[PDB]
Amino acid sequence: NLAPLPPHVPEHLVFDFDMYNPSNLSAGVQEAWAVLQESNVPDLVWTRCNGGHWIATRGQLIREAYEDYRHFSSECPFIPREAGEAYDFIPTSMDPPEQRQFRALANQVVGMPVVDKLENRIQELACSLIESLRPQGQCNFTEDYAEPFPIRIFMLLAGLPEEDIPHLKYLTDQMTRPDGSMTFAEAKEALYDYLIPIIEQRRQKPGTDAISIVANGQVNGRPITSDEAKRMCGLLLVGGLDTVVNFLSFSMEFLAKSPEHRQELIERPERIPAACEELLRRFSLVADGRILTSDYEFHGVQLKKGDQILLPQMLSGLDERENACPMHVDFSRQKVSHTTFGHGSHLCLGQHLARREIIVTLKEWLTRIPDFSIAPGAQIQHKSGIVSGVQALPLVWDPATTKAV
Ligand code: HEM
Ligand SMILES: CC1(C)[C@H]2CC[C@]1(C)CC2
């Protein structure tokens, strides 16, 4: 379903990319998207899918657009429009200077100092899940570790019941990798139905959890409204549940296929941080956009007020102008260039959390299970969307090569 080309779109800039179902998904999600960076694709293209929208293809342009909130607004950050429209998360659907107060608050909940406080638990949980798997010689990494790990840590941070995981996870999924089962607004309303009562309760009888801290916060000298808290937490949930989960699967899928990369980390552990960055560049997985507030000529292309443009954070670090041999993993690149956690005023607040979770997993898994691979005759399927994913990751290993710690 291709929408008729708008009058202002030069036909030579058309390139029908479907962000939800790119062409050679078989090859991998990042490979599927990287087709946008082949020599035959202009820097800025218009696609007819998903109702019609611009896509910037190069790191240079993604960053500029992200810096420029005057022209590129976060008011409608998701494609298709109805989703971007229904989208009312904070601080994500806001521009500076308004955005800045809400951010300062979310920072209170997820920033560095929270991570540092939670460090021991993160380690405790990782060690426990891993040790628990070790003797089996086989898992479903996606259901077995990648979901539980990040998700339990969040449920802990938020002070919410683990029991709610399945329901929540479904709703969060519908948002980033729409199934067709429920529309964005519906999905938004259900999560919101979840949260409302919860917020009500923590406004009355505050705890020490993230939700209590948000429900009772100050923004611009005055108190946050019930709607504002619902809208902040809503975001906290989607980042909590859906980002780290997918990243780990990509990373582990790669590790499973590359013995020499594993060994490298085993023997020269001082490289883990460097490797974490490189993996963040290569298996980048978020693609959102902005809305043109007005008519604006950008790198010689005329954008019309109201036009949406996808600025794939995934793409920057995959761009050959930014990283020589992009599709190659090299733990010792001089410079790892990416915008995995975004760029501009919306830079990921949960970055410190994400990094800490990634580093622990690598260190801890490799410690106990140094040698592993993908299950014979398993065909790994990636999924595309706002947040890209892995459907399932069947791993196998020989117990006898594992190390109890
Ligand atoms: C692999 C991990 C993650 C990746 C790749 C990631 C990616 C991103 C991206 C690309 C943005 C900017 C979106 C925009 O500019 O439209 C963002 C913002 C955000 N993320 Fe992260 N995210 C990750 C983990 C997390 C975690 C663990 C949390 C906390 C629960 C979270 C919470 C946030 C918040 C609150 C914002 C918005 C900040 C603002 O608008 O000022 N993210 N993230
Ligand atoms: C990954 C994201 C793009 C960041 C802002 C919206 C989202 C879908 C959750 C956290």
Coordinates of N, CA and C and ligand atoms in Angstrom, one line a residue, residues 66 74 77-78 87 90-94 99 102-103 106-107 110 154 157 232 235-241 243-245 247-248 280 284-290 313 339-343 345-351 353-355 357-358 387, ligand 1:
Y66 N 18.4 16.3 14.1 CA 18.3 16.1 15.5 C 18.7 17.3 16.4
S74 N 9.5 17.1 17.7 CA 9.2 15.8 18.3 C 7.8 15.6 18.5
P77 N 6.7 12.0 16.5 CA 8.0 11.4 16.4 C 7.9 10.0 15.8
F78 N 6.7 9.4 15.7 CA 6.5 8.1 15.1 C 5.8 8.1 13.8
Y87 N 0.7 9.5 20.0 CA 2.0 9.5 20.8 C 2.0 10.8 21.7
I90 N 6.3 11.8 27.5 CA 7.1 12.9 27.9 C 8.4 12.2 28.4
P91 N 9.6 12.8 28.1 CA 9.7 14.1 27.4 C 9.7 14.0 25.9
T92 N 9.5 12.8 25.3 CA 9.7 12.5 23.9 C 8.9 13.3 23.0
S93 N 7.6 13.6 23.3 CA 6.8 14.4 22.4 C 6.9 15.9 22.6
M94 N 8.0 16.3 23.3 CA 8.2 17.7 23.6 C 9.5 18.3 23.0
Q99 N 10.6 20.7 27.2 CA 11.2 19.3 27.4 C 12.2 19.3 28.6
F102 N 11.0 18.3 32.3 CA 10.5 16.9 32.4 C 11.7 16.0 32.3
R103 N 12.7 16.3 31.5 CA 13.9 15.5 31.4 C 14.7 15.4 32.7
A106 N 13.0 12.9 34.8 CA 13.2 11.5 34.4 C 14.6 11.1 34.7
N107 N 15.6 12.0 34.6 CA 17.0 11.8 35.0 C 17.1 11.4 36.4
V110 N 16.3 7.4 36.5 CA 17.2 6.6 35.7 C 18.6 6.9 35.6
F154 N 14.0 -3.6 35.9 CA 13.1 -2.5 35.7 C 11.9 -2.6 36.7
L157 N 13.0 -1.4 39.9 CA 13.3 0.0 39.9 C 11.9 0.8 40.1
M232 N 4.9 10.3 31.4 CA 6.3 10.1 31.7 C 6.5 8.5 31.9
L235 N 6.5 6.2 29.0 CA 7.8 6.1 28.3 C 8.8 5.2 29.0
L236 N 8.8 5.4 30.3 CA 9.8 4.7 31.2 C 9.6 3.2 30.9
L237 N 8.4 2.7 30.8 CA 8.0 1.4 30.5 C 8.4 0.8 29.2
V238 N 8.2 1.5 28.1 CA 8.7 1.1 26.8 C 10.2 1.1 26.7
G239 N 10.9 2.0 27.2 CA 12.4 2.0 27.3 C 12.8 0.9 28.2
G240 N 12.0 0.7 29.3 CA 12.4 -0.3 30.3 C 12.4 -1.8 29.7
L241 N 11.3 -2.1 29.1 CA 10.9 -3.3 28.5 C 11.3 -3.8 27.2
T243 N 13.9 -2.1 24.9 CA 15.2 -1.7 24.2 C 16.3 -2.7 24.4
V244 N 16.7 -2.8 25.7 CA 17.8 -3.6 26.1 C 17.6 -5.1 25.8
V245 N 16.3 -5.4 25.9 CA 15.8 -6.8 25.5 C 16.3 -7.2 24.2
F247 N 18.5 -5.5 22.0 CA 19.9 -5.3 21.8 C 20.8 -6.6 22.2
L248 N 20.4 -7.1 23.3 CA 21.2 -8.3 23.9 C 21.1 -9.5 23.0
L280 N 27.1 -1.6 20.2 CA 26.1 -0.6 20.1 C 26.1 0.0 18.7
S284 N 22.8 -1.4 16.3 CA 21.9 -0.3 16.6 C 20.5 -0.7 16.1
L285 N 19.4 -0.3 16.8 CA 18.1 -0.8 16.5 C 16.9 0.1 16.7
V286 N 17.1 1.4 16.9 CA 16.0 2.3 17.0 C 15.8 3.2 15.8
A287 N 14.6 3.4 15.3 CA 14.4 4.3 14.2 C 13.1 5.2 14.4
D288 N 13.4 6.4 14.8 CA 12.2 7.3 14.9 C 12.4 8.5 14.1
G289 N 11.4 9.5 14.2 CA 11.5 10.8 13.4 C 11.1 12.0 14.1
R290 N 10.8 13.0 13.3 CA 10.4 14.4 13.6 C 9.4 14.9 12.6
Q313 N 18.2 6.4 13.9 CA 19.5 6.4 14.7 C 20.4 5.3 14.4
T339 N 24.9 7.0 16.8 CA 23.9 7.8 17.5 C 22.8 6.8 18.0
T340 N 23.4 5.7 18.6 CA 22.5 4.6 19.0 C 21.5 5.1 20.0
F341 N 21.9 5.9 21.0 CA 21.1 6.4 22.0 C 20.6 7.8 21.6
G342 N 20.6 8.1 20.4 CA 20.1 9.4 19.8 C 21.1 10.4 19.8
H343 N 20.6 11.7 19.6 CA 21.4 12.9 19.4 C 20.5 14.1 19.6
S345 N 18.8 17.1 22.0 CA 18.2 17.3 23.3 C 17.5 16.1 23.8
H346 N 17.2 15.1 22.9 CA 16.6 13.9 23.4 C 17.5 12.7 23.7
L347 N 18.7 12.9 23.8 CA 19.7 11.9 24.1 C 19.2 11.0 25.3
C348 N 19.2 9.6 25.1 CA 18.8 8.7 26.0 C 19.3 8.9 27.4
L349 N 18.3 8.9 28.3 CA 18.6 9.1 29.7 C 19.0 7.7 30.3
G350 N 18.4 6.7 29.8 CA 18.7 5.3 30.3 C 19.9 4.7 29.7
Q351 N 20.8 5.5 29.2 CA 22.0 5.0 28.5 C 22.9 4.3 29.5
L353 N 22.1 2.9 32.3 CA 21.5 1.7 32.7 C 21.8 0.6 31.6
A354 N 21.5 1.0 30.4 CA 21.7 0.1 29.3 C 23.1 -0.4 29.2
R355 N 24.1 0.5 29.3 CA 25.5 0.1 29.2 C 25.8 -0.9 30.3
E357 N 23.9 -2.9 32.1 CA 23.3 -4.2 31.8 C 24.1 -5.0 30.7
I358 N 24.6 -4.4 29.7 CA 25.3 -5.0 28.6 C 26.6 -5.5 29.1
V387 N 11.6 0.0 17.1 CA 12.7 -0.8 17.9 C 12.8 -2.1 17.1
Ligands
HEM1 C1 19.8 -0.4 24.2 C2 19.2 0.5 24.9 C3 18.5 1.7 24.4 C4 18.6 2.4 23.3 C5 19.3 2.0 22.0 C6 17.8 3.6 23.4 C7 17.6 4.5 22.4 C8 17.0 5.7 22.7 C9 16.8 6.8 21.6 C10 17.3 6.5 20.2 C11 16.3 7.8 22.2 C12 15.9 9.2 21.6 C13 14.6 9.2 20.8 C14 14.3 10.5 20.1 O1 15.2 11.3 19.9 O2 13.1 10.4 19.6 C15 16.0 7.5 23.6 C16 15.5 8.3 24.6 C17 15.0 7.9 25.8 N1 15.3 6.7 26.4 FE1 16.6 5.4 25.7 N2 17.2 3.7 24.7 C18 17.7 2.6 25.4 C19 17.5 2.3 26.7 C20 16.7 3.0 27.6 C21 16.4 2.6 29.0 C22 17.0 1.4 29.7 C23 15.6 3.6 29.5 C24 15.0 3.7 30.9 C25 14.0 3.0 31.3 C26 15.3 4.5 28.4 C27 14.7 5.7 28.5 C28 14.7 6.8 27.7 C29 14.2 8.1 27.9 C30 13.5 8.5 29.2 C31 14.3 8.8 26.8 C32 13.9 10.2 26.4 C33 14.8 11.4 26.8 C34 14.3 12.8 26.3 O3 13.4 12.8 25.4 O4 14.9 13.7 26.9 N3 16.1 4.1 27.3 N4 16.5 6.2 23.9

